[PDB]
Amino acid sequence: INTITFDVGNATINKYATFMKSIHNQAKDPTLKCYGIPMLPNTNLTPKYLLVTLQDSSLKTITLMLKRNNLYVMGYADTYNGKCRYHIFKDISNTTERNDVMTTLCPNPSSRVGKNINYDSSYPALEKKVGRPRSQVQLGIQILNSGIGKIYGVDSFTEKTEAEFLLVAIQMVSEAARFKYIENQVKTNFNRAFYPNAKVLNLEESWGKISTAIHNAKNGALTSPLELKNANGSKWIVLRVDDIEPDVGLLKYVNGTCQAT
Secondary structure, three states: OOOEEEEHHHOOHHHHHHHHHHHHHHHOOOOOEEOOEEEOOOOOOOOOEEEEEEEOOOOOEEEEEEEOOOOOEEEEEEEEOOEEEEEEEOOOOOHHHHHHHHHHHOOOOOOEEEOOEOOOOOHHHHHHHHOOOHHHOOEOHHHHHHHHHHHOOOOOOOHHHHHHHHHHHHHHHHHHHHEHHHHHHHHHOOOOOEOOOHHHHHHHHHHHHHHHHHHHOEOOEEEEEEEEEOOOOOEEEEEEHHHHHHHEOOEOOOOOOOOOO
């Protein structure tokens, strides 16, 4: 719990941009890249996880634990009464993962309470909970800041207040780090709440396929054009890595050799 902190309460663009470069610099494999784009490491490369602390305007704090190999959030922690309260997702199930998650988040026994999250850590599960597709749930720097207050130190919040905060934090953190395009959308709408546009949604949903495509590209040309959606909703066919390259920040891990540059 020696972590990367983002002060959402007094965020500035230059602040958020440094917060993303920190995650990008700890999450990326030290050597693997494809066409200049860094790639995430295999699961055996320790640190296996990353801790990101989000702090609000009242110095309240919430730390998220992410698997480094893929950037998916495993659970989070806050402070309840005078103890570390870890909340893990229902889908985190290897028995060696939820304990690593519990003891990394709150490393002192009998000074921690568990408040398991009874649902899966995946878009459908969370959309279900808030009851509304993520396209209708706004994102924003003041939105994330408030979310923190609905959670920290309160014993009953609602699975809807919590899933909602998570949907926001996952995109403004994991999706933004994986895609330069999403980060730029946040930065572009920093001083306002906004809805993810057709392309932020398609990219989040297309991360694995985009990563395989770019890993497999021969001499810079995709082995198979890719049909993606663009901002305003229309088809968008990328035939080359340089067509998509400016939008991607971190490639999923695909084992094998690719054109380093």
